[PDB]
């Protein structure tokens, strides 16, 4: 009569898509979008799963991060899809081990224009745009 819980699970998409008219930027075979509507870090999974088809919350590897930051603005921050699973450090929906500054947080990760690594924030309820990806 009050609250309902929805255990949602998220994975990387198996299909191929790229909106050539509305993408934020593109690198290799992946088209990256910045959500125009700000969201929380947890909501970014659903927000990216529904911006465009075959799109999900992406975590930037050291080689993609400079491009993401170059497509960013001075005062703009961006939630990134790097999450913790205990040991084995931080990872993404694409797998791999990420270098994450985890001193002042352990849950949500974001990047700015001048961020050199993904940085974990102490509060995940902040409203920042999401970084979504779709392979071409």
């Amino acid at each position: 009569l009050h609250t309902f819980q929805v255990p949602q699970n998220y994975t990387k998409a198996n299909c191929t898509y790229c909106n050539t008219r509305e993408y934020t930027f593109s690198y290799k075979g992946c088209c990256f979008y910045f959500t125009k509507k700000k969201h929380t870090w947890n909501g970014c999974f659903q927000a990216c799963a529904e911006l465009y088809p075959c799109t999900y919350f992406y975590g930037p590897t050291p080689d993609i991060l400079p491009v993401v930051t170059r497509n960013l603005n001075a005062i703009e921050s961006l939630w990134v899809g790097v999450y913790r699973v205990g040991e084995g450090n931080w990872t993404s929906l694409d797998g791999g081990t990420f270098k994450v500054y985890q001193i002042f947080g352990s849950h949500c990760t974001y990047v700015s224009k001048f961020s050199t690594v993904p940085v974990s924030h102490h509060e995940c309820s902040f409203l920042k745009p999401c970084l979504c990806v779709s392979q071409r």
Partner: antibody, heavy 120, light 108 residues
Framework: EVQLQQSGPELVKPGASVKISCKAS????????MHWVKQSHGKNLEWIGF????????GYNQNFKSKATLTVDNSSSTAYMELRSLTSEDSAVFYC?????????????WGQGTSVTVSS | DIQMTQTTSSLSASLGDRVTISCRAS??????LNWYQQKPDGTVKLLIY???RLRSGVPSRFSGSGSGTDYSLTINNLEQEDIATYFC?????????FGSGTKLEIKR
């Protein structure tokens, strides 16, 4: 410009307390962390601690926990540091520092410094 | 327990020369090293962050390099405004720690 204005020089009796102030300016207060560092003698710097400007959460160096207390006034955009039980070894210059946005391992803006003298 | 050791406490060089200040960490700090400059009036401003990233506004005469435990800050074409003390600072773990500092004096 001046964006991090610190309090003036303070002279405190041994064993007493002191409240150093650090006023903010040109930036959104609740998006950063405020660090406090101690410079004793004429060079040696010592990181005292930090405070989350949003919720007021704090973190301290273990050599400063029973001396420093960090507080924040969100509406006035101020960060306060209370030092207690000051001995003649605490005569030093205390700095407040706003960290780099997106790089919290670095402090990109510093105060002018507040000199605290402890003597009878 | 990460300690920062500065190899030198005082450096002397002429105008237009090149000075290199070195810092050493007791353990790997994964490039989380910053270089700050404190001038005689006590004003401190961050020159370099993340080993080599030059903060916007600082002249390109300042540069950084290093890895693991060894890091270095280089000032090329020494100017009279560079008379100051230079500190290294690791941010890899808490508590943050600083180096002893290196005072740069102009030799004439």
């Amino acid at each position: 410009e001046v964006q991090l204005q610190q309090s003036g020089p303070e002279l405190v009796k041994p064993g007493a307390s002191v409240k150093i102030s650090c006023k903010a300016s040109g930036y959104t207060f609740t998006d950063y962390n405020m660090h406090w560092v101690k410079q004793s003698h004429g060079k040696n710097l010592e990181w005292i601690g930090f405070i989350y400007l949003y919720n007021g959460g704090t973190g301290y160096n273990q050599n400063f926990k029973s001396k420093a207390t960090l507080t924040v006034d969100n509406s006035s955009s101020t960060a306060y540091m209370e030092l207690r039980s000051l001995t003649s070894e605490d005569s030093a210059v205390f700095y407040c520092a706003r960290d780099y946005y997106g790089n919290p391992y670095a402090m990109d803006y510093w105060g002018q410094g507040t000199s605290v003298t402890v003597s009878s | 327990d990460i300690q920062m050791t500065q190899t030198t406490s005082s450096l002397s060089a002429s105008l237009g020369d090149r000075v290199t200040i070195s810092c050493r960490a007791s353990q790997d700090i994964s490039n989380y090293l910053n270089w700050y400059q404190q001038k005689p009036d006590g004003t401190v401003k961050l020159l370099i962050y993340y080993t080599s990233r030059l903060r916007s506004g600082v002249p390109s005469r300042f540069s950084g390099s290093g890895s693991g435990t060894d890091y270095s800050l280089t000032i090329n074409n020494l100017e009279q405004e560079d008379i100051a003390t230079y500190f290294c600072q690791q941010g890899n773990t808490l508590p943050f720690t600083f180096g002893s500092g290196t005072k740069l004096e102009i030799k004439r």
